[PDB]
Structure 1
Amino acid sequence: ATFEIVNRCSYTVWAAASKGDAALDAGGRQLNSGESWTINVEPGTNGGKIWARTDCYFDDSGSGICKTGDCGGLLRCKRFGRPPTTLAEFSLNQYGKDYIDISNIKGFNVPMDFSPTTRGCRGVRCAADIVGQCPAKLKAPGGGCNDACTVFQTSEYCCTTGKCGPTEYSRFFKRLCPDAFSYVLDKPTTVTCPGSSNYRVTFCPTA
């Protein structure tokens, strides 16, 4: 499956793509404002994620650091990124279907649209100004808006015991972005698409 990753932001981002234990495709690449980078993700990929990273420096070997989304200092990500990270999430060819969603469970750094380029389902979007409206205690000094698990490390925010409910903090993400996961046990906003769909992830989809 092809995922076209498009940076509409006015600033450079370094796209990242991983299933947690491995890169997807090259795993990471710089995208200047306006650039598009198409990756190929193997069918059957379960638990894939694509995200943006901001204010990165890499040296000539592809080692460095990003202020949001850093995945162990590599350009070419093999693991998930350091919060805060808006997440495009997908499992492909799961008993005949694809599942996609955007999640704010690991915080928000960059607005995002995650849409199929092929027929038979709809896209999802979290494009509100979550960084600018971020509650004081969630603001990440490094840039972006942290989820409350990252900040406070409690069973309630992290949903450790599997029994959490919504919180003042989760409710802020859900109010700004109703169509993205705001906490682990949020009512799902997962979209079912035909198996083997193709996709576009757009950073900063709206002015």
Structure 2
Amino acid sequence: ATFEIVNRCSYTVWAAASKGDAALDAGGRQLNSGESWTINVEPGTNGGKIWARTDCYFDDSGSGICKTGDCGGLLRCKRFGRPPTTLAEFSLNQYGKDYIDISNIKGFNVPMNFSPTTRGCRGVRCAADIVGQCPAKLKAPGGGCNDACTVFQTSEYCCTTGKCGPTEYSRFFKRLCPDAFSYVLDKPTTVTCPGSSNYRVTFCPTA
């Protein structure tokens, strides 16, 4: 499957693409404002994620740091990024279907559109100003809006027992982005696509 990753942000992001134990394609790249990065994702990729990283410094060997979504200090991500990270999430060719969503379960750094470029289903979007409106106790100093599980490390916010409810913090992300996961047992906002759909992830889709 092709993912086009477009930075529509006025600022540079460092796109990242990972399935948690491995890079997807090159796994990361600098996107200046308006730049597009096409990646190939293997069919049958389960638990794939795309995210932006903000304020990166990388030396000549691709080693450094980001204020949001840093994955062990690499330009080319093999691992998931550090919260806060708006997540484009996908499972491809799962019994003849693609599953896509946006998640705020690991917080929010960069507004995001995740859409098919092929026919047969709809995109999802989390484009609200979640960082500007972010509750005082979730504000990451680096930039972005932590989820309550990253900040407080409770069984309720992390949904550790597999039982828990919505919270004041999950309802803040859900109110600004109804079409994204706000907590682990949120009513699913997963869109079903045809197996072998292609996608665009757009950072800052409206701004």
With the shorter chain as reference, the TM-score category is: over 0.9
Q: Write the deviation string for residues 95-129 of structure 1: whole angstroms up to 9, x where unpaired.
A: 00000000000000000000000000000000000
SS of the equivalent of 1:16 reads strand
Are residue 179 (structure 1) and residue 198 (structure 2) matched?
no
Deviations 1:65-106 (A, max 9, x none): 000000000000000000000000000000000000000000
CA RMSD across the alignment: 0.3
State the SS of the aligned residue for 1:133. Answer: coil
- SS in structure 2 of the partner of residue 92 of structure 1: strand
Aligned residue pairs total 207
Q: How far apart are the structure 1 equivalents of 2:77 and 2:169?
A: 29
Q: Give the Cα separation in 2 of the matches to 1:81 and 1:29.
A: 14
CA distance in 1, matches of 2:4, 2:141: 31
* Residues 134-190 of structure 1, C-alpha deviations (whole Å, 9 max, x = no match): 000000011100000000000000000000100000000000000000000000000
- Deviation per CA, 1:21-47, whole angstroms, max 9, x where unpaired? 000000000000000000000000000
- Give the 3-state SS of the residue equivalent to 1:169 in structure 2: helix
Pair 1:203-2:203 in alignment: yes
Please give the alpha-carbon distance, in whole angstroms, between the structure 2 residues aligned to 1:131 and 1:31.
Answer: 21
Unaligned runs of 5+ in 2: none
Structure-1 separation of matches of 2:75 and 2:183:
29
1:126 and 1:21 mapped to 2: Cα distance? 26
Helix, strand or coil for the counterpart of 2:188? coil
Q: Provide, for residues 54-75 of structure 1, a one-character-per-residue CA deviation record: whole Å limited to 9, x for no partner.
A: 0000000000000000000000
Which ranges in structure 1 are unaligned for 5 or more consecutive residues?
none
**Aligned mates of 1:127, 1:118 — CA distance in 2:** 22
CA distance in 2: counterparts of 1:76 and 1:15, whole angstroms: 9
Residue by residue over 1:6-33, the C-alpha shift from the partner in whole angstroms, topping out at 9 and shown as x without a partner, is 0000000000000000000000000000
| Other structure's SS at 2:91 match | strand
For 1:123, the equivalent position in structure 2 comes to: 123
* Structure 1 runs, 4 residues or longer, greater than 4 Å off: none
Equivalent residues in 2 for 1:155-170, closer than 5 Å? 155-170=155-170
Distance (whole Å) between structure 1 residues aligned to residue 82 and residue 27 of structure 2: 15
Q: With structure 1 as the length reference, what TM-score do the two structures score?
A: 1.00
In 2: Cα distance, 1:7 partner to 1:196 partner = 24
Write the distance in 2 (CA, Å) between the matches of 1:120 and 1:30: 31
Paired position in structure 1 for 2:141: 141
- Distance in 2 between the 1:103 and 1:166 partners? 15
In 2, Cα distance between equivalents of 1:192 and 1:146: 28
Counting aligned pairs with the same residue, the percent is: 100
Quote the Cα distance in structure 2 between the aligned partners of 1:13 and 1:146.
Answer: 18
